[PDB]
Design a protein around this ligand. Structure first.
Ligand code: 1YE
Ligand code: 1YE
Lengths: 182, 182
């Protein structure tokens, strides 16, 4: 299935690269946050998985209570055939009742952008119902891969969410804070 | 199918990013090769697609007549949700009868590493015959995507190859030189 390929490629071609040294980067970042009240960043990579159509270009614009703060130190990759690539990860503040309630490394899972594009291009043969079915299966498959994987290690957390078509009351910051608070 | 997901994700998540400015990077690189005898780099990204099992960790070690020379100038990416990533591409010399016969940007298609890993991990449910079938379909599917794609533009060339199980006479440098010479 499409989802099975996307889940394995995202693990092999991203998570496996980025997770092993994530903790050390976070540790380095948190040297500037010895005052806990200034908001040290939490330890995990939180991966957002909106099942519904589209993924926002700008994560912080998804929710007024999620605000971009800055970046972790960069990760240089020189293995698995790739030469000198540099990856970045972003740190966001989560607000609740006007005050910072959490700080974390957040990002959308990129293969959802591929599922979205396939649904737009008719040569992909991919209906909207197919897109949703594969998005769901991508999430399940990736969950299962990570349960086994050596590189996590309490390193990564998937946050999948789907909103009712007729309501816009879902709060992404609240959803992430739920995961943070445990 | 697995291949369909891999082909679309490699287009959306790599080729679409790297191809639009490739020409300009090559032009910049070739400022140091105004003497053609020193070997200016050819214009396309040549993507190697070995269908057989495994992809070499080190492209230049695949063939004594392919030698790594150096890198293009880097490509900074800050769009499609990714913040400040830096990509690189490698320039190789191709030799024939002891002398340089071509110079090009070469790399293996990364989703083949994913197909290889899926064949190694039993939770993937993926036999060796499945792996080959999907590798072939990945190549066909990607070919078809690129035929349409706006970002190439005589920018990219796929070089797929499969060797007989009982013979080791295939020369990768000769195969690439064939494509270069047209
Ligand atoms: C911008 C973009 C869009 C889609 C993918 C993708 O499907 C995809 C699937 C597997 C692995 C990757 C690599 C990554 O997320 O760095 C992928 O990257 C994508 C990227 C970077
Ligand atoms: C090291 C490695 C391994 C596998 C993939 C991959 O399957 C894959 C599939 C689609 C898109 C990408 C992104 C890329 O090649 O930069 C992919 O990247 C991979 C990388 C970088």
């Amino acid at each position: 299935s499409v989802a099975h390929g996307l889940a394995w490629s995202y693990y092999i071609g991203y998570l496996r690269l980025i997770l092993p040294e994530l903790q050390a980067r976070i540790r380095t970042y948190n040297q500037h946050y010895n005052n806990l009240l200034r908001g040290a960043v939490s330890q995990r990579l939180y991966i957002l998985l909106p099942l519904d159509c589209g993924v926002p270009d700008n994560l912080s614009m998804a929710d007024p209570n999620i605000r971009f703060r800055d970046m972790l130190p960069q990760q240089n990759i020189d293995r698995a055939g790739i030469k000198n690539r540099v990856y970045s990860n972003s740190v966001y503040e989560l607000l609740e009742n006007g005050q910072r309630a959490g700080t974390c490394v957040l990002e959308y899972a990129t293969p959802l952008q591929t599922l979205f594009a396939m649904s737009q291009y008719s040569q992909a043969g991919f209906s909207r119902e197919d897109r949703l079915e594969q998005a769901k299966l991508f999430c399940r498959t990736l969950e299962d891969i990570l349960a086994d994987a050596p590189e996590s290690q309490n390193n990564c957390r998937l946050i999948a969410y789907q909103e009712p078509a007729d309501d816009s009351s879902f709060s992404l910051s609240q959803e992430v804070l739920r995961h943070l608070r445990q």
